[PDB]
Amino acid sequence: AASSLDELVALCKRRGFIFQSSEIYGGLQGVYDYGPLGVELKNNLKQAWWRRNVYERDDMEGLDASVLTHRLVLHYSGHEATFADPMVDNAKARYWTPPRYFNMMFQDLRGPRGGRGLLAYLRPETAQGIFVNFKNVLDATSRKLGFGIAQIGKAFRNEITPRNFIFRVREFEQMEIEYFVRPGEDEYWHRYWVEERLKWWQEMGLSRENLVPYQQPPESSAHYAKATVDILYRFPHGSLELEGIAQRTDFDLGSHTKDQEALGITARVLRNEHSTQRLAYRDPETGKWFVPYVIEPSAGVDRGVLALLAEAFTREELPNGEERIVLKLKPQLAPIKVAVIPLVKNRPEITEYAKRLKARLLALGLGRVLYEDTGNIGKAYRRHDEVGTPFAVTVDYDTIGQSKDGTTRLKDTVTVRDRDTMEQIRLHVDELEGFLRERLRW
Numbered sequence: 001a002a003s004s005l006d007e008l009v010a011l012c013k014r015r016g017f018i019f020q021s022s023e024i025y026g027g028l029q030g031v032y033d034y035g036p037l038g039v040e041l042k043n044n045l046k047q048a049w050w051r052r053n054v055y056e057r058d059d060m061e062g063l064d065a066s067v068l069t070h071r072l073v074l075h076y077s078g079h080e081a082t083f084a085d086p087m088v089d090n091a092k093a094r095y096w097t098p099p100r101y102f103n104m105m106f107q108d109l110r111g112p113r114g115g116r117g118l119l120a121y122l123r124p125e126t127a128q129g130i131f132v133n134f135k136n137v138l139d140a141t142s143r144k145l146g147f148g149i150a151q152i153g154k155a156f157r158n159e160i161t162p163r164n165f166i167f168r169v170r171e172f173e174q175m176e177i178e179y180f181v182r183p184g185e186d187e188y189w190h191r192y193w194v195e196e197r198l199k200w201w202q203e204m205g206l207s208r209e210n211l212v213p214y215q216q217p218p219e220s221s222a223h224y225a226k227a228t229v230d231i232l233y234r235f236p237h238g239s240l241e242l243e244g245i246a247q248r249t250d251f252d253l254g255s256h257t258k259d260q261e262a263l264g265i266t267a268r269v270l271r272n273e274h275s276t277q278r279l280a281y282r283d284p285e286t287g288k289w290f291v292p293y294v295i296e297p298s299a300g301v302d303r304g305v306l307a308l309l310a311e312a313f314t315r316e317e318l319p320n321g322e323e324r325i326v327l328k329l330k331p332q333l334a335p336i337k338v339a340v341i342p343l344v345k346n347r348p349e350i351t352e353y354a355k356r357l358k359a360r361l362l363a364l365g366l367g368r369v370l371y372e373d374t375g376n377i378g379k380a381y382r383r384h385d386e387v388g389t390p391f392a393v394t395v396d397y398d399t400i401g402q403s404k405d406g407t408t409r410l411k412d413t414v415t416v417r418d419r420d421t422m423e424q425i426r427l428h429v430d431e432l433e434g435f436l437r438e439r440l441r442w
């Protein structure tokens, strides 16, 4: 584990993981930019989640709706209502500083002028994009009930207060699922998904010891959610929310469908005077139109990253030197898998061999390979553990052929230094393939 968020924040900048957004002009607090190594890690997390919840499954369809949301969507979603109370602050008390309707959803206008007619919010959550497209998806796929639609996407929130690095921010991405289910089964499903999502975060690298499901109680059970379970993580600042396996119940489709009344809505949904379409399902064997309940697993992509980094940032002491900080990311999720390093930057015959090898290895398809050509190998080696790349293959003279001893047997064999054990095997190129194949493969 990583001792203090500070370190994390500092490694993140010093290595190009996360940079402060708009830093040169003062920075837009609450919004960050993912530098080079950040992107990679971030994408890999996104990818693996997609593989898991979509490719490997057989009851999920994917989606990717837009950030701009038509004013009504967020209205019937109830999101509007949450800020229709102005706050007339005062000296020692609260809701006299002027009436501030403290809306958390960002706001923008559609062309021409700032009229209430052409208003649109930036989706505070990806979720809505799925509910409104429910029929559309159902039509094009023609899915039978035990099934859900899932997307990764941007989400903007005017967070009055952004706190703790890349945790609570104003702009972030979420990986959301909306498991549509027959009314009765909701209980199981909710259980199933919580267990699943916890199972996942573990294979991703988060130790079970730090993961904790927590039944939000009535007080905290937000409107749509009939129940909800968070999976908190023991971050370096605390045991906070990581993913939230909720259990809204036909409320979403209910607040968004035509004929709410005719439809047996069980949720206290607004009178939807708008929807152009009946967002409901039709036949189990009878032909009873009904509105599906949903289990919704929402993860924060950015926090998933905070977790993974916090969890992996270890700073062991060297049994010789002082100490080293070592990101020990699940190899398969490291920004770089293998980093090929030329021993002397001079010898062009060496470097060429190096650049050449990088190719051969990238080809295995175990992940990104890097031709690190930066100065001091001691420096290269370190840089790497700091960014947690699993294997550092280094090429010296002997590899190419030359040597002092006049030996060419060392040729085509390279030294592969392992991150965690810092152990240095010296294996022949052809073996290097098989070797990595065993480790970096999922």
Ligand SMILES: Nc1ncnc2c1ncn2[C@@H]1O[C@H](COP(=O)([O-])OC(=O)C[NH3+])[C@@H](O)[C@H]1O
Pocket (backbone or CB within 6 Å): 125, 126, 127, 157, 159, 166, 167, 168, 169, 170, 171, 172, 174, 176, 241, 242, 243, 244, 296, 298, 299, 300, 301, 302, 303
């Ligand atoms: N400002 C923010 N920054 C980062 N992640 C955030 C966030 N606000 C919410 N999340 C993520 O959204 C997840 C779900 O909580 P939520 O309050 O976003 O609810 C919903 O998205 C309901 N669909 C959390 O587990 C968290 O990872």
